């Protein structure tokens, strides 16, 4: 008799928590790397935005002028 | 040496009462935890009677404030009829007073009593007696059994033990010897390594309050059920004839009491002798490990037709809260639940008065000072060394009968009043000796600091080459 | 400073006791060298002239001593490791399972640990730092994995810990 | 003694390990692989050399949800809530190793002697003979007819892995593969789930068989049991629960078999094994592959007579009650509260050998064989 | 209290020293407070640079 629950249903009315967020659409243009997300309603909760922090992982080439 | 499957047969517990789930079950009340909350000064809840409860005023429905643990449960459930632990007086005890009633008395004696021609009073008195023998007698027996301050002390200490919080935790830490492992049954006091009692810390918020509330409820049920079973197995059919004669002799007075609570006050007294109560109270409340409670919880669940693996399910969730919110039958269960909540909030389980006044090292300076010198003892004069094991035994055994308020929630160190009795150390009594031991320890430490490295001093002269101020 | 009683902390009541202690004249264990070259064969020597003991008694009433008298009425193991070894299966001797309040472990060298337990080890031909005695261990990064057998253990309880992958 | 308690001495060892990131929960599409059809044969043994390498990571084709254990989509809601609530770093798997005595003797005679503590009477004497490997470099080169140190080291590691995992797995193939044992396993499953034949037997006798329980053939005739609740649920949840029920039953069967073995050893058997190992050392050290050496060792320590005497009366009758009790005690010890919604132990097991770390291949085979019996029996 | 030893033997590798303590009447002896006092001659060898 099961299908799928929701994070809002679970958790506690007096509990803070972190959520990872994989973006919905990503376009890697010539000079920009656009990323788009989708947030969830803060029912019984409010979203501390300044607490948010990204997480990047990539490759770097420092050029022939690295001594 | 055991050659047998782990499960065993136990006729003590195997009895269940089947009745329909209340419309006002715990799961169907979102704000139940709000009312169930207790504060400082709360008094132990008391039994209720039909005199002040005219009519019962009242399967699961997803409520607006259904908390996570209840939200998934209210959904995956084939709830038709939930069984309840059969909490009742011995079947014979009951037989004695139902056969005595059977209407054997008739209406002539009742009219003689009432001294009035109205049959309405006769019917009301008959209903009062029936209700008393059905629910109010049992409620009175519970009230007397579990309200003894010594018995409440015993319950509080066993709960302290089982949930490993407070003074027992301090003793385990200081002892270096694990004390939670002691599990008992009728005072046998066995010991089991295969027992978990520190897993309740993984839960917090409203998940904890409820869970503990449950564990305590089943523990109380287990206590009462084993008590009733051991009483039943020690019944004398000669005592049955004596009870018959006493009932015959006393019925004339028993049918002539105006209050219903009074009616039940005397019936328990006649039927429940004080000597038997004291004998049962000797060593009956026995340490129960969380694992055994969960096993009993699974027993209740399966026997009642719910798979234990259909996610979360607690028997304590299928039970009403207030007396006027429950059918007469399950009133004993309601009383048990209120008692369990009172104990749970009393014991600080969410210290009570078992920890703060004297057993608390922070509050008790003498005990702390005695602890500080636990190991630095030494006396040969041809052992006398204060070993961890001895101090912990002294700490555990001690308990001040006074300053333990069993009538309401006081939580000493929240009151702005002095303690009933002065705080004293467990083994050491005279403070002069403790002062001397502290002094020698301080001199020891200061000398070790002054000359710990050893010092180089000039060979020719006698000054220090590496003096430290 | 005397150490045995610094960690045991003994006190003596009447009795007129005798207290005898021995000292070392082996140069390797008493001295130190930056290089660590056997100081014994190099030509270093030690010699004492007079040792005297200084002790400090303290007052305590006989009543207090009588009150006390009437009132109260770590193991070290070294395992071998042949050269160029990678596995090391060990078996602890069976002692009282209690008091197992955690254990430590580190790796040393045979040439550095002295065969303590005699009067004089002729095979101790090094006078540098003795990590077995002054706690200057340095071969802690040479550990890969430690596995306990399936026997159950109290958790502060896994079986294998990975040191470095 | 307390009625609702337990203290045995041969069913609780509980090997502890970190949950493989490739465990059953983390594979959302596990259900499709678990599907079996008519053309299916019993799962086969796998050796360390047979598989090229082990990979523990979640791997490709698995995408983390937009919310040890990583939340994923395309999985039963039970898994979702489980992952949202529990993310433990260790689980107390049942122990399926061979008894410590036989394994210790095998290792001491074959691989290396256990080095007892150095008692303090002397030092700096390199008496390596006590701690020297059972077979030296020169002897190994002679037997292998090559001076290449790489070949020596690879053969050494090969049979070290062999004696650590495969010999254990080999015994199992034999012990669970017998067709007669297969018939008995089917019969016990039918009895515990009261399906078909057992239902008609109860109808004919007018007595429900739910009270029939056995332990080493000494039946206890317990009466508090009910094995009809599972019929209420249906779907992938039913398959998962049954697949677990059977996996735990198989684990209990092997554990009790390995207990009865461990009980019946004597120093005479110790010396017999020692003699056999020393006399045959060469034929074990020189082998084509890990299957041959595993089989030979099995015959050395698992004679057909011994297997035979164990199989009789091994698959004891067991109730769903007994099963839940075991599961409960497994999760209790792992440090996981039973009050948690829908936690079962089979979630923490990789599906097949390519992803499992070596130590858990026994559990992998137990799970695969469990699935095969579950599907073949037509659990519906 | 200073304490000159009763018997001293200077063997090849050891320097044994033996004392004799006094009864702690109305007093108890803090042993860990004890500390020795050595005086000797040291030769650091030809490898001292």
CA torsion sign, D288 to D289 to D295 to D301? positive
Q: Which residue has the tokens 């770590």?
A: C74
How many Å apart are CA B126 and CA B120, to the nearest integer?
10
Tokens of D378: 């037509």
Q: For residues C12 and B251, give the distance between their C-alpha atoms in angstroms, rounded to a whole number.
A: 77
Please name the residues in contact with C75: beta carbons below 8 A apart, sequence gap of 6 or more. Answer: C95
Q: In angstroms, what CA-CA distances link B198 with B269, C99, C157?
A: 41, 20, 14
Contacts of C14 (CB under 8 A, 6+ apart): B381, E23, E24, E25
CA distances from D344 to A3, B196, D25, D246 (A): 19, 18, 10, 12
Site of tokens 């009175």 = B140
Give the residues across from D76 on adjacent strands: none
Dihedral over Cα of D95, D98, D99, D100: its sign: negative
Beta bridge partners of C37: C126
Which H or E run contains B276? helix B274-281
DSSP string of D204-232?
A: HHTS-GGG---STT-----------GGGG
Phi-psi region of E25 (alpha: psi -120 to 50; beta: other; left: phi over 0): beta
Can you tell me the distance from the alpha carbon of C52 to that of C19, in angstroms, rounded to the nearest whole number? 12
First to last CA, chain D: 41
Tokens of B209: 């309050």
Find out whether B160 and B167 touch, Cβ atoms under 8 Å. yes
Residue of E3, E4, E9, E13 best to disrupt the C interface, most CBs of C under 10 A: E13
According to DSSP H, which parts of B5-118 are helical? 32-36, 68-75, 91-101, 108-114
Chains A and E touch (3+ CB pairs under 8 A): no
Burial (CB < 10 A; 0-12, 13-18, 19+), residue B234, is: exposed
- Helix residue ranges per DSSP H, chain D: 30-34, 77-85, 100-110, 128-131, 137-144, 149-161, 167-177, 179-193, 197-205, 236-263, 267-285, 290-301, 304-311, 320-334, 361-376
Whether the CB-CB separation of D356 and D95 falls below 8 Å is answered with no
CA angle, D321 as apex, D315 and D324 as ends, to 5°?
95
Annotate D207-225 with b (16+ C-beta within 10 A) or e (fewer): ebbbebbbbeeeebebeeb
Distance CA C100, CA C154 (A): 9
- Closest-CA residue to D15 (of C3, B423, A4, C153): C153
CB within 8 Å of B138: residues ≥ 6 apart: B87, B88, B89, B332
Closest CA to D33 of D354, D335, D351, D370: D351
* Residue B156, helix vs strand vs coil: helix
Residues 181-200 of B with CB under 8 A from D: 183, 185, 188, 190, 192-196, 199-200
E15-18 and C45-59 strand pairing:
unpaired
Burial grade of B386 (CB within 10 A; 0-12, 13-18, 19 or more): buried
Task: Give me the residue from D18, D122, D131 closest to C82, CB to CB.
Answer: D131
Interface residue B289 vs chain D (CB under 8 A): yes
DSSP three-state, residue B238:
helix
Three-class DSSP category at B85 = strand
Q: What is the CA radius of gyration of chain D?
A: 23
**B182-183 and B190-191: which strand pairing?**
antiparallel
User: Could you give the angle at which helices B237-254 and B260-271 cross, rounded to 10 degrees?
Assistant: 150
The total number of residues shown for chain B amounts to: 469
DSSP 3-state of D36 = coil
Query: What element of type H or E holds B327?
Result: none
CA distances in angstroms from B292 to B197, B238, C49, D7, D259, listed in the order given: 10, 37, 72, 12, 25
Which residues lie across from C47 on neighbouring strands? E41
Question: DSSP 3-state assignment of B215?
Answer: helix
Helix (H) or strand (E) holding B172: helix B167-175
The b/e string for C29-42 (b: 16+ C-beta within 10 A; e otherwise) is beeebeeebbbbee
C-beta of residue D213 within 8 angstroms of C-beta of residue D319: yes
Cβ pair C130, C144 in contact under 8 A:
no
Query: Three-class SS of residue B328?
Result: helix
How many angstroms separate the CA atoms of B303 and B319, rounded? Answer: 17
d(Cα C48, Cα C25) in Å, to the nearest integer? 9
Contact predicate C89/D107, CB 8 Å: yes
CB D307, CB D175: distance < 8 Å? yes
Which tokens is B387 given? Answer: 């070993």
- Three-state DSSP at B136 gives helix
3-state secondary structure of B76: coil
Query: B312 with D339: CB under 8 angstroms?
Result: yes
**CB-based contact, B465 to chain E, within 8 Å:** no
Structure tokens at D162: 């062999």
Question: Which tokens in the block code for residue D27?
Answer: 């594979």
On chain D, the residues whose CB falls within 8 A of the CB of C121 are: 123
User: Using the 8-state DSSP alphabet, how is residue C126 labeled?
Assistant: B
**Cβ <8 Å between E39 and B459:** yes
In our burial notation (b when 16+ CB lie closer than 10 A, e otherwise), range D127-161 reads: eeeebebbbeeeebeeeeeeeeeeebeebbebbbe
Size of interface C-E (CB pairs under 8 A): 165
What 3-state class would DSSP assign to C165? coil
CA atoms within 13 A on the CB side of D177: 12
What six digits make up the tokens of B327? 């059918």
What is d(CA B4, CA D220) in angstroms, rounded to the nearest whole number? 8
Pairwise CA distance, residues D332 & B291, whole Å: 8
Tokens, residue C50: 């007079």
Cα-Cα end-to-end distance for chain B = 67
- Residue C156 CB neighbour total at 10 angstroms: 4
Q: How far is B385 from chain C (nearest CA, A)?
A: 8
Cα–Cα distance measured from residue D160 to residue D106, given in angstroms and rounded to the nearest whole number: 11
Rounded CA separation D308/B40 (Å): 69
Give the integer Cα–Cα distance in Å for C22 and C119: 10
Tokens read off for C9: 């902390």
| B378 contacts in chain E (CB < 8 Å) | 31
* Token couple for B452: 């710990």
DSSP E strands in E1-49: the ranges are 2-3, 7-10, 15-18, 27-43
Which residues have a C–N gap over 2.5 Å right after them in chain B? Answer: 58, 102, 350, 382
Query: Contact B366/C52 with Cβ under 8 angstroms?
Result: no
Residue-wise burial string across D258-287, b where 16 or more C-beta atoms lie within 10 A, e elsewhere: beebeeeeeeeeeeebeeebeeebeebbeb
Tell me the backbone φ, ψ of residue B418, rounded to 5 degrees: -75, 160
* Displacement of CA D244 from its chain's centroid (Å): 14
Interface size B-E, in CB pairs within 8 Å, comes to 15
Q: CB count, 10 Å around CB of A8?
A: 13
- State residue B271 phi and psi, 5-degree precision: -85, -30
Q: What are phi and psi of E29, to 5 degrees?
A: -95, 110
Q: Does E32 contact B448 at a Cβ distance shorter than 8 Å?
A: yes
CA dihedral for B110, B111, B112, B116, sign (positive or negative): positive
Q: What span, in angstroms and rounded, lies between the C-alpha atoms of B368 and B346?
A: 25
Q: Shortest CB distance from A12 goes to which of B72, B75, B205?
A: B205
Question: Contact at 8 Å (CB) between E4 and C14?
Answer: no
- Backbone phi, psi, residue B313, to 5°: -165, 125
> Per residue in B271-294, is it b (16+ CB within 10 Å) or e — as a string?
bbeeeebeebeeebbbbbbbbbbb
∠B127-B129-B132 over CA atoms, to 5°? Answer: 105
Phi/psi of residue C111, nearest 5 degrees: -70, -15
Those residues with Cβ within 8 angstroms of residue B233's Cβ, 6 or more apart along the chain or in another chain: none
Is residue B153 within 8 Å of residue B406, measured between CB atoms? yes
User: Which residue among A1, A2, A9 sits closest to B68, beta carbon to beta carbon?
Assistant: A9
Cβ neighbors of B463 (< 8 A, separation 6 or more) are B457
Give the whole-angstrom CA distance, residue C113 versus residue D6: 48
The whole-angstrom separation of Cα B133 and Cα B248 is: 16
CA dist., res. E24 & res. E28, Å (int): 5
Helix, strand, or coil (residue C54): strand
Q: Using only the alpha carbons of chain A, give its radius of gyration.
A: 19
To 5 degrees, how large is the angle CA B265–CA B267–CA B268? 70
**Experimental method, per PDB record:** cryo-EM
Which is nearest to D187 in space by CA: D307, D315, D310? Answer: D315
Find where tokens 């650590």 sit. Answer: D164
CA E34 – CA C56 distance, rounded (Å): 7
Measure the CA–CA gap between D350 and B289, rounded to whole angstroms. Answer: 34
CB atoms within 10 A of CB D40: 12
Asked if residue B42 lies in contact with residue B409, where contact means CB atoms within 8 angstroms, the answer is yes
Chain D positions in Cβ-Cβ contact with residue C123 (cut-off 8 Å): 123-124
Q: Number of helices and strands (H, E) in chain C?
A: 5, 5
Q: Which two tokens stand for residue D320?
A: 């769903």
Task: Give first-to-last CA distance, chain E, whole Å.
Answer: 41
Give the B window 189-228 contacts with C, CB below 8 Å.
Answer: none
Q: Which of D64, D81, D235 sits opposite A22 (nearest CB)?
A: D64
How far does CA E22 lie from the centroid of its chain? 17
């Amino acid at each position: 008799p099961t299908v799928a629950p929701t994070h809002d249903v679970t958790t506690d009315r007096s509990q803070r928590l972190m959520l990872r967020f994989v973006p919905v659409d990503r376009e890697d243009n010539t000079y920009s790397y656009k990323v788009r997300y989708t947030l969830a309603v803060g029912d019984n909760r409010v979203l501390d935005m300044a607490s948010t922090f990204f997480d990047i992982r990539g490759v770097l080439d420092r050029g022939p002028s690295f001594k | 040496p055991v050659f047998a499957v782990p499960e065993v047969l136990a006729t003590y517990h195997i009895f269940f009462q089947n009745c329909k789930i209340p419309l006002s079950c715990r799961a169907n009340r979102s704000r139940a935890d709000k009312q169930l909350a207790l504060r400082q000064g709360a008094v132990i809840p008391d039994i209720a009677s039909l005199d002040e409860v005219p009519k019962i005023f009242e399967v699961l429905v997803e409520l607006e404030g259904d908390n996570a643990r209840l939200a998934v449960l209210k959904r995956s459930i084939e709830v038709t009829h939930f069984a309840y632990p059969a909490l009742n007086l011995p079947p014979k005890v009951m037989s004695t007073v139902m056969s005595e009633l059977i209407p054997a008395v008739g209406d002539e004696q009742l009219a003689r009593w009432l001294e009035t021609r109205e049959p309405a009073d006769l019917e009301e008195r008959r209903k009062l007696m029936m209700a008393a023998v059905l629910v109010t007698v049992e409620l009175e027996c519970m009230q007397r059994f579990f309200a003894d301050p010594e018995m409440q002390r015993k319950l509080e200490e066993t709960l302290h033990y089982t949930f490993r919080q407070g003074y027992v935790r301090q003793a385990c830490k200081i002892s270096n010897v694990e004390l939670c492992n002691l599990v008992s049954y009728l005072g046998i006091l066995h010991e089991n390594r295969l027992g978990q009692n520190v897993l309740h810390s993984t839960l917090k918020g409203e998940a904890r309050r409820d869970y503990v509330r449950d564990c305590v409820y089943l523990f109380l049920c287990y206590t009462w059920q084993t008590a009733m079973g051991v009483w039943q197995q020690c019944l004398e059919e000669r005592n049955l004839k004596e009870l018959q004669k006493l009932l015959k002799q006393n019925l004339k007075d028993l049918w002539t009491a105006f209050n219903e609570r009074s009616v039940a006050a005397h019936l328990a007294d006649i039927i429940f002798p004080e000597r038997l109560l004291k004998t049962l109270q000797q060593g009956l409340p026995d340490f129960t490990s969380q694992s055994m409670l969960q096993n009993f919880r699974n027993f209740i669940l399966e026997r009642s037709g719910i798979l234990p693996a259909t996610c979360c399910a607690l028997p304590s969730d299928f039970v009403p809260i207030k007396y006027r919110e429950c059918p007469p039958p399950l009133w004993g269960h309601c009383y048990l639940l209120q008692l369990a909540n009172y104990l749970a909030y009393h014991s600080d389980i969410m210290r009570c008065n078992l920890c703060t006044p004297h057993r608390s090292l922070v509050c008790n300076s003498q005990l702390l000072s005695e602890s500080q010198i636990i190991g630095t003892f030494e006396l040969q004069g041809p052992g006398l060394k204060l070993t961890p094991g001895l101090w912990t035994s002294a700490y555990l055994r001690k308990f001040v009968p006074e300053d333990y308020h069993a009538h309401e929630i006081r939580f000493y160190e929240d009151q702005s009043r002095p303690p009933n009795a002065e705080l004293t150390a467990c083994v050491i009594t005279q403070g002069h000796i403790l002062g001397q031991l502290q002094a020698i320890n301080k001199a020891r430490q200061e000398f070790l600091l002054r000359k710990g490295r050893g010092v180089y001093l000039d060979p020719q002269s006698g000054e220090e080459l590496n003096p430290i101020p | 400073p005397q150490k045995f009683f610094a960690v045991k902390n003994l006190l003596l009541l009447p009795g007129s006791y005798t207290y005898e202690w021995n000292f070392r004249k082996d140069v390797n264990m008493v001295l130190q060298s930056s290089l660590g070259n056997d100081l014994r064969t190099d030509g270093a020597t030690i010699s004492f002239t007079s040792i005297n003991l200084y002790a400090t008694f303290f007052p305590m009433a006989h009543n207090t001593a009588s009150t006390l008298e009437a009132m109260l009425r770590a193991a070290n193991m070294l395992y071998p490791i042949p050269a160029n070894a990678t596995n090391i299966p060990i078996s602890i001797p069976s002692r009282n399972w209690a008091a197992f309040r955690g254990w430590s472990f580190t790796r040393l060298k045979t040439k550095e640990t002295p065969s303590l337990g005699s009067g004089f080890d002729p095979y101790f031909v090094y006078s540098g730092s003795i990590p077995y005695l002054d706690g200057t261990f340095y071969l802690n990064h040479t550990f890969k994995k430690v596995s306990i057998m399936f026997d159950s253990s109290v958790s502060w309880s896994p079986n294998e810990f990975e040191i470095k992958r």
